[PDB]
Amino acid sequence: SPEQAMRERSELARKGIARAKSVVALAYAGGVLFVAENPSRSLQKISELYDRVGFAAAGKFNEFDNLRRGGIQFADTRGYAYDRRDVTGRQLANVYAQTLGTIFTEQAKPYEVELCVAEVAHYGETKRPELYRITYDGSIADEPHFVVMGGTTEPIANALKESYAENASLTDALRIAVAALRALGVASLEVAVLDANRPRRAFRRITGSALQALL
């Protein structure tokens, strides 16, 4: 019975997502902020896909690391084939949707992952940041303000809705993100920004003493 097979496959992927650390991506005045509860300093859940395109993921590390490498390969190949400015976050989101749908339907075990692709404007251009969420089955959604992935996302989402404010500063937005995650310290936090003020590469990791001085 294919209906029961898909239902239990979806249950497996969703349950795998439920017991994973949460990630929040939000739009602030300077671009996009990623905050994740990541104890390790070596296994990074937030990465740069391309100049103005950033990647966040929740779930099983090897699976979304495979997806991250595939997306980086796609972005670099596309930017070389046509131009760097021709790479948008929407194309990468669509590629992730195709890949995750095919994986969910055909692979022996579905990927218990949940991805967010975030894009900021180019240097000297005005555009609201774009947040795309891609789920295990390949369902793709547009989020105007924030994305919450992994764990019990309802309390974190509710805290964000009660405490989100567009055009916030980096410091304040970080405070809201950490407070919503709690519902941690400089350790067990991985924080990065897509910084729209940079000329070419918007991705910037905020770690260590700078993160504490910003927290």
């Binding site: 084939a81 046509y82 131009d83 400015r85 021709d86 948008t88 194309q91």
Partner: protein
Amino acid sequence: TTIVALKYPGGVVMAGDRRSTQGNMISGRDVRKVYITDDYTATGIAGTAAVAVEFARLYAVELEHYEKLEGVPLTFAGKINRLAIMVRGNLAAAMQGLLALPLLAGYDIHASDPQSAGRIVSFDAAGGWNIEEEGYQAVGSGSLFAKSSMKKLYSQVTDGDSGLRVAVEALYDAADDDSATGGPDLVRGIFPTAVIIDADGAVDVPESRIAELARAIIESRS
């Protein structure tokens, strides 16, 4: 063959002659060498006529296909890269004799300044591309004569009409010095084709305007 292109305040103009010759024999008299690739770029290909038509069709198809797939057209740099890839993929045919030199005129709508948004891109046989800052370029057998004519006539380019006149006059000089380029045929009434690209898009010049300009040039040269 000679295809000239030049920038004027507010846009670009690309003009091309009409003769096709196989050896010393005139085979075609109304060949159209300038193509409106998309709404803001025109391309003119010198060399083998078959390769020219085939490449123009392929390039237009590639640009339209990208725009339809991705929901947004390529940037100007993307279009240049696609054209350069096509040129680099023709080296074996060039050595075989199925050669093609393209020239690309465009209007960057994302360019900050509208009055300098015109672009001219020249390609060499090896596939390299160059954005011209001198304001004019030419390809074909009579390209040298047309370029040296435009070097002296470019000071009087101020708007679209004077730029069109200068392009037609450069084509006239190229035809005057190169037998593979056809001049204005006042007997058959065949004149060079031209495309003007500005902020409103790329439009083919009506044959009447070029006929009037060519007649004025011929009357001046007598």
